[PDB]
């Protein structure tokens, strides 16, 4: 147990010191390494329960049982007198840089997970390279370091959402006494895009500085794993070379899918193109029904656009379907049109994009409903949001032996290890895990600590909370109502629910019973909270704190004994009492 | 023991049915009572682990041991055969209405706690009266049913806070691309006040309708307890009479204090007057430094006022003082002036309030600083926020025997009982308790269930979360850093902290490092979270859910293993890592 841990730790750490907090000899070695600018991990044996047994086990490698003991890439280097000898003779720098491979770690992909992993590993002395390359979209769009969320996902999406929310704030301001007239105010798309892209630019630059300041090598090059330790890289000038690494982390993410119909690639766009588009989309069709589809349609309508969403079957497949339908109903009452049970057949071009006057083109969209009736309408912009996929055939030679599942994602054990022992995978390409930025960041950081600092903590992927940033936001943590009933049976499930009205909505004359929350609980397990759901403003701020209590096993009684904060929306969770089985109305 | 619970339950309940969920004689008695419109409590002995011992205990009163046992006001009424015979002879209604007193419960005070307690008691067949009267302020202000929070507290205060927040939304909107010019937009105070007051009006009306629909007798009359069971009432027409009640709940709340200086009562106002004031206060002095003082100064500055705050010693006494100083620093950078270490000596009138044309007057304020220097400046409005106090002298005859503390608050045991066994106190007049609206509501509801439905659960007053609605909001749950250090010692306390920047503030060009959060933890108890603190937007929404986790005993490890929701402010709590002891800067 302890002896297997110590061997794994010694073999994979780049530079590591076994120490005690009280030892002045350990203190002296720490000071030497700090002066020499030699980064390393440290294990403090006195603060571990099995510290005495670990100290015994070290002799299997060093033949000594005292602290300090310093190791480099699996090799015992010395105790205090020996380390000082090397430093005094100007030998220590060469010893700590001796390596079989070019790098201790190569990260393929410079996004949410990969940048987090590479920075954390470098902290413990791992010589690290991060590779990032952005394949242009069909119309030619590209962007800088930081991945999907930074450039074409979470960050610009929520900033445009905030511009859309301010439309309603301008309306509400009249009722609260301000002299403006929302009727005479309009939105300038390109001014908003300039501001969003300026912030994104500062993040691109900030990641480059952070890698520079952590001594991480950044290569703006496309990588391909051609054997367990060899990565072939192609740089900006199409120069091809090979670099080697001890450990490999795959973190290459996904890109939007297109339907296989005429005109889709030529004349439509995806979210990759939307967030830097130089002109307002105009009259827009969004094809699809994921959270990406509904978030983008939502803010486009708030910013004054004529928006239609064409839905093949249901909204937000995979989420609680009562909540999904409430989300869609709010959007439809606030200016989004839906073409339900409908798919596209072809896109025909009526007008080329006008670069001269900074204006969209014009497209004819033909499709059909499930009963066979036809769909035909003109739109200035068509946005495809029909899912995302990895393309690991490009990243990864078949002969390496890394196992992929039926959707092309990497099959990993619960420590992110692939079927090849030195290769790991994190983020969206890890099969079966929630595809979210804070999941990729936690996975990458925790993995770096296990590989290079002897940590044992794994990432917990269960009950990860989400928020959908539609015009009225939807936060969730845990099971949908229908999954809970499927797993445990209707008899063992009790659901508490209520409508509510934000206080800010009263003087503004907004709707009385649209916002909604519910707790899905298991009767036979002390009324354990299985899932939490809320539709209302600031839904992500509301939901986050409860994710801790659910992780700790909160029951309905834990919610009841907690006192609310007044006046808030979130406090309504502390006093819920109407059950669905009672048939009593949830309106207030 | 079981037998003392039963004897207390029987003696106290108005109408109560001892039952089992699987007995058809029980079910038949319930249907008769339902049909007769007879409300009652029900105890299902089969769902209680000590049910069989209760049945033997029942024979004390009834000399039977079987289920169906009906009691009315301490007296056994009958089993199934007796109850059904009374009903078919039209004798049952008279039996269940028989009472020694006018009411089972008299609530003195119709505010947050008192309305809650009275409605809940009525659900179990307690014949209930709620008394409410609003003594006018010195200038004559009065209002309707619902108490301090509804009419002159949390509700109008947060609505005027929202009007202030919207001024910054109007500024932000230009940066997000909207065509308005905030420079050319102004605020109309009277439009605001008219909308706030029309909402409060709908709440006064809703409380009257709610009492009628629960068969609660509402008396708009001043009450005075003159003996344990007699309440003297007076009467919009000054008619004095006496009504009697079995149980009494005191819920009369507090009112603002005035300093004992010339001109204060004549020429200053309080929060009681501010929320319906028909003229804009203009150049305003706020005297005091409580959360009421700072909240009101904050929104008045945001709505265009020239505002000064006069501070005797410190800001937000009783709150974490690091956090209090950050709250005030933001306020000072956004147009609130502070006269620190300063106290008033007299208010002189220079011009009378123009009630005709809705203009304030003019006042000369004279004061002095602690060094000795003089204060003298003109203001159009002077607002006193120097604390709140009860006036139980008016409510409670000294001869009844209800003990008060040195501040005039009621001394209660942990079940809200006073030194007189049938008299209880809830809300702000209960000595030692947090003075918050959801605390009053939970105390009131839970107490009514113990008196009239045999419940045993007590209100938990520990770790009750708060939010101060200053222009940048401050949420907290648990201990301040300085109380934790005083209670456990500096060596046993670890503090994790970080600045943050809301994503909404990036494109709007707001401050990088003013929002702030921290977790105060106890090392020797598994890094238990003792206190949580956040300064930023939507702080009450952020804080609420974490209050459940802290009640369940969250540790730092529970926060670390939980995954964040991105992009939010609240997610910063899930990745905190900089300790105060390390000395590393908390900036982003
Ligand atoms: C529109 C949209 C909105 C979203 N909103 C949210 C939200 O609100 N909250 C949330 O939590 N998540 C959100 N997400 C999801 C989030 O963006 C992803 O879960 C996250 O970015 C995944 O990170 P990753 O590290 O796995 O991959 P990525 O961030 O996609 O990083 C992979 C990087 O590697 C590069 N790369 C690919 N192949 C190679 C190669 N061969 N060599 C070198 N580099 C290569 C890619 O170009 C990219 O830069 C959103 C996603 C989208 C599309
Ligand atoms: C400016 C301000 C802002 C506040 N903001 C918040 C906030 O954001 N959040 C929060 O949780 N709390 C807030 N509070 C506190 C909250 O208002 C109180 O905790 C709550 O109102 C107390 O309820 P209560 O039932 O104890 O008394 P009250 O609500 O004051 O009700 C007592 C009632 O009894 C009446 N009465 C008095 N004497 C008699 C008599 N003899 N006969 C009949 N009736 C009588 C009173 O006039 C009143 O109607 C705020 C308070 C103030 C002043
Ligand atoms: C055998 C006695 C019948 N009886 N006598 N008085 N009332 C009732 N029944 C009822 O009130 C009802 C029970 C179920 C539906 S109505």
């Amino acid at each position: 147990g302890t002896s297997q841990w110590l061997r794994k730790t010694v073999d994979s750490a780049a530079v590591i010191l076994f120490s005690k907090t009280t030892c002045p000899y350990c203190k002296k070695v720490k000071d030497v390494l700090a002066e020499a600018k030699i980064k390393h991990a440290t294990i403090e044996l006195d603060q571990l329960s099995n510290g005495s047994a670990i100290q015994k086990c070290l002799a299997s490698f060093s033949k000594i049982e005292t602290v300090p003991q310093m190791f480099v890439r699996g090799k015992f280097i010395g105790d205090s007198q020996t380390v000082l000898k090397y430093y005094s003779n100007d030998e220590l720098a060469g010893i700590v840089n001796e390596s079989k491979y070019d790098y201790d770690l190569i990260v393929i992909g410079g996004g949410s997970g990969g940048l987090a992993a590479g920075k954390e590993a470098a902290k413990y002395g791992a010589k690290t390279a991060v590779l990032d390359y952005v394949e242009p979209t069909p119309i030619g769009t590209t962007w800088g370091l930081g991945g999907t969320c930074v450039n074409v996902g979470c960050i610009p999406k929520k900033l445009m959402h905030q511009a859309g929310l301010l439309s309603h704030a301008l309306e509400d301001a009249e009722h609260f006494g301000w002299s403006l007239d929302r009727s005479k105010i309009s939105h300038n798309w390109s001014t908003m895009v300039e501001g969003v892209q300026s912030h994104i630019g500062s993040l691109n630059w900030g990641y480059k500085v952070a890698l520079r300041d952590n001594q991480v090598t950044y290569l703006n090059a496309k990588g391909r794993l051609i054997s367990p330790h060899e990565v072939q890289i192609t740089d900006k000038n199409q120069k091809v070379s090979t670099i080697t690494g001890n450990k490999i982390i795959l973190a290459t993410g996904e890109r939007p899918k297109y339907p296989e119909i005429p005109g889709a690639v030529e004349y439509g766009i995806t979210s990759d193109d939307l967030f830097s588009l130089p002109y307002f989309p105009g009259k827009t069709l969004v094809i699809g029904a994921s959270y990406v589809a509904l978030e983008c349609a939502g803010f486009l309508a708030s910013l004054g656009g004529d928006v239609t969403v064409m839905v093949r079957s249901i909204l937000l497949r995979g989420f609680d379907q009562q909540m999904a339908e409430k989300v869609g109903d709010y959007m439809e009452n606030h200016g989004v049109k839906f073409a339900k049970l409908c798919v596209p057949d072809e896109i025909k071009q009526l007008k080329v994009v006008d670069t001269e006057n900074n204006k969209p083109g014009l497209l004819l969209v033909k499709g059909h409903y499930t009963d066979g009736k036809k769909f035909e309408e003109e739109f200035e912009t068509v946005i495809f949001a029909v899912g995302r996929e990895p393309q690991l055939s490009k990243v990864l030679c078949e002969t390496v032996g890394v196992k992929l599942d039926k959707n092309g994602r990497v099959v990993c054990t619960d420590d992110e290890q692939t079927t090849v022992s030195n290769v790991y995978a994190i983020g969206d390409i890890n099969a079966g895990k929630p595809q979210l930025t804070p999941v990729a960041i936690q996975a990458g950081r925790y993995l770096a600590r296990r590989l290079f600092a002897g940590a044992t903590e794994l990432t917990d992927y269960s009950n990860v909370a989400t928020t959908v940033f539609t015009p009225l936001e939807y936060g969730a943590c845990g099971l949908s109502e229908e999954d809970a009933i499927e797993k445990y049976g209707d008899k063992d499930i009790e659901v508490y629910h209520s409508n509510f009205k934000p206080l800010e909505w009263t003087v503004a004359h907004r709707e009385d019973n649209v916002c909604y929350m519910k707790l899905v609980c298991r009767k036979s397990d002390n009324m354990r909270v299985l899932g939490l759901h809320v539709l209302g403003p600031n839904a992500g701020e509301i939901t986050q704190g409860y994710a801790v209590a659910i992780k700790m096993g909160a029951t309905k009684a834990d919610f009841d004994r907690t006192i609310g904060i007044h006046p808030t929306c979130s406090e309504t969770f502390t006093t819920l009492h109407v059950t669905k089985k009672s048939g009593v109305s949830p309106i207030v």
Side-chain angles (χ1 to χ4, degrees), chain A:
Chain A
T2 290
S3 100
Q4 306 156 144
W5 170 84
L6 184 66
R7 169 150 202 219
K8 183 199 199 153
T9 297
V10 169
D11 291 341
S12 62
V15 187
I16 186 162
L17 182 70
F18 290 89
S19 176
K20 281 178 205 208
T21 53
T22 46
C23 182
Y25 294 96
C26 304
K27 185 78 182 123
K28 178 61 174 171
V29 170
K30 285 192 259 225
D31 290 349
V32 172
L33 299 182
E35 179 171 289
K37 309 310 226 103
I38 294 172
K39 297 179 295 179
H40 60 97
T42 303
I43 307 270
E44 296 290 12
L45 295 189
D46 55 318
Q47 324 217 102
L48 286 183
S49 162
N50 49 351
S52 300
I54 293 161
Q55 210 168 345
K56 264 279 156 183
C57 278
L58 279 165
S60 325
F61 307 82
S62 63
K63 297 171 180 226
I64 66 169
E65 290 175 62
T66 47
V67 290
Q69 298 188 33
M70 162 179 195
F71 293 73
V72 170
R73 298 183 184 84
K75 156 167 190 113
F76 175 65
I77 288 327
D79 62 1
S80 165
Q81 177 165 329
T82 300
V83 171
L84 281 47
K85 190 278 189 173
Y86 293 138
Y87 193 56
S88 177
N89 288 265
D90 300 323
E91 289 163 341
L92 185 63
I95 286 155
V96 304
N97 294 121
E98 211 44 83
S99 176
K100 179 197 202 151
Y101 303 103
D102 296 322
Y103 296 101
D104 295 297
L105 173 64
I106 298 174
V107 182
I108 310 183
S112 291
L115 294 162
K119 281 182 279 110
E120 185 75 4
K123 295 214 334 213
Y124 307 107
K127 178 71 172 333
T128 303
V130 172
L131 280 38
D132 197 51
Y133 168 70
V134 177
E135 187 59 38
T137 71
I139 70 186
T141 314
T142 193
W143 53 81
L145 181 66
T148 289
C149 182
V150 170
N151 294 280
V152 291
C154 317
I155 298 299
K157 171 271 292 274
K158 207 196 180 191
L159 284 164
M160 311 212 159
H161 171 59
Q162 171 80 351
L165 291 175
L166 292 159
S167 175
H168 279 62
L170 296 180
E171 280 152 17
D172 297 352
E174 307 190 30
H175 300 280
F176 282 86
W178 294 95
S179 59
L180 78 173
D181 186 354
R182 166 74 182 82
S183 312
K184 295 134 109 173
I185 291 156
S186 67
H187 187 258
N188 184 318
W189 169 266
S190 53
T191 299
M192 170 185 80
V193 168
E194 290 294 319
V196 169
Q197 292 292 333
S198 192
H199 179 59
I200 290 168
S202 78
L203 299 176
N204 297 145
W205 181 245
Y207 286 122
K208 288 169 89 184
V209 173
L211 291 190
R212 194 199 65 211
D213 293 3
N214 276 266
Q215 291 72 49
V216 172
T217 300
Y218 168 49
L219 307 179
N220 183 25
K222 176 151 109 133
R224 177 169 170 84
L225 194 62
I226 62 169
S227 75
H229 300 286
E230 313 181 275
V231 182
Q232 145 181 297
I233 61 185
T234 305
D235 66 9
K236 232 46 190 193
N237 299 123
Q238 318 288 144
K239 190 174 109 103
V240 179
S241 64
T242 289
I243 59 169
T244 65
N246 190 6
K247 308 298 174 183
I248 307 300
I249 292 175
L250 307 171
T252 49
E254 300 191 318
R255 293 298 285 279
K257 290 181 182 165
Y258 284 80
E260 265 278 303
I261 63 179
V265 177
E266 300 84 351
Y267 310 128
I269 62 169
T270 70
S271 59
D272 280 356
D273 302 302
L274 180 61
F275 299 114
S276 65
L277 210 63
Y279 42 83
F280 184 59
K283 185 188 180 190
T284 297
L285 180 66
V286 177
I287 297 169
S290 64
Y291 70 89
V292 173
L294 303 185
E295 287 175 348
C296 290
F299 68 71
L300 283 175
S302 293
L303 303 177
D306 180 344
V307 189
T308 301
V309 180
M310 154 200 303
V311 177
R312 176 191 291 268
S313 39
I314 63 176
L315 305 185
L316 304 179
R317 183 171 292 279
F319 291 91
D320 187 285
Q321 283 295 294
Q322 173 192 33
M323 298 312 285
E325 151 170 61
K326 286 174 180 294
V327 166
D329 289 348
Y330 185 89
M331 296 186 43
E332 191 167 41
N333 286 316
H334 295 263
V336 174
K337 291 170 276 171
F338 290 83
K340 304 205 173 263
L341 313 175
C342 190
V343 295
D345 290 312
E346 73 183 323
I347 314 300
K348 191 278 181 83
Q349 179 183 64
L350 300 181
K351 283 154 83 151
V352 179
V353 166
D354 187 355
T355 311
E356 226 56 46
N357 295 127
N358 192 41
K359 193 230 196 65
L362 187 59
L363 307 170
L364 190 59
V365 175
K366 294 170 75 163
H368 67 276
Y369 297 90
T370 52
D371 61 4
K373 293 216 173 45
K374 298 300 153 156
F375 177 95
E376 185 168 316
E377 192 176 354
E378 290 179 9
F379 298 94
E380 297 172 280
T381 298
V382 174
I383 306 178
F384 296 110
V386 294
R388 294 167 63 70
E389 62 187 354
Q391 297 114 42
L392 290 176
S393 82
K394 289 207 101 274
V395 183
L396 187 55
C397 181
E398 325 300 25
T399 68
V400 187
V402 171
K403 185 189 195 184
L404 307 179
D405 75 1
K406 54 158 154 223
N407 307 129
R409 299 177 173 90
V410 186
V411 181
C412 303
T413 45
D414 70 355
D415 58 356
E416 286 78 54
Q417 197 189 40
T418 71
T419 48
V420 179
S421 66
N422 66 299
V423 183
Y424 293 76
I426 62 175
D428 291 353
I429 67 168
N430 186 330
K433 314 298 188 288
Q435 300 189 308
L436 304 161
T437 278
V439 173
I441 293 170
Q442 182 115 322
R445 290 188 179 141
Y446 280 23
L447 173 60
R449 296 168 191 174
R450 298 199 298 281
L451 292 165
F452 298 114
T456 59
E457 202 71 279
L458 306 176
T459 290
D460 181 358
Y461 296 97
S462 72
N463 292 312
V464 175
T466 57
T467 292
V468 174
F469 293 100
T470 39
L472 195 58
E473 304 169 3
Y474 166 38
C477 182
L479 298 186
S480 67
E481 183 168 331
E482 59 266 37
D483 288 358
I485 292 172
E486 197 195 317
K487 185 161 170 81
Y488 297 109
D490 193 45
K491 176 286 262 193
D492 203 23
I493 298 300
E494 187 92 284
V495 182
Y496 300 92
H497 64 146
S498 183
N499 294 117
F500 59 100
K501 192 182 192 182
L503 180 58
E504 295 74 28
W505 284 20
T506 59
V507 166
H509 298 276
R510 298 200 172 280
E511 303 96 319
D512 296 319
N513 286 291
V514 181
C515 299
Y516 183 79
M517 33 171 89
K518 71 181 182 181
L519 291 182
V520 175
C521 309
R522 186 172 177 205
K523 309 198 217 173
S524 62
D525 184 29
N526 301 320
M527 220 54 75
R528 195 82 49 196
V529 179
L530 297 176
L532 173 151
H533 299 272
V534 55
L535 179 70
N538 308 300
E541 312 292 352
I542 294 176
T543 301
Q544 175 71 94
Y546 300 103
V548 187
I550 287 157
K551 176 66 72 204
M552 305 158 72
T555 64
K556 180 60 164 64
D558 293 316
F559 280 68
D560 297 334
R561 68 201 179 110
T562 307
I563 305 297
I565 301 177
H566 185 65
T568 63
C569 300
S570 193
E571 72 177 310
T572 306
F573 276 115
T574 64
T575 64
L576 296 169
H577 64 104
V578 174
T579 68
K580 279 186 182 191
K581 256 106 155 67
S582 78
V584 170
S585 192
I587 61 188
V588 290

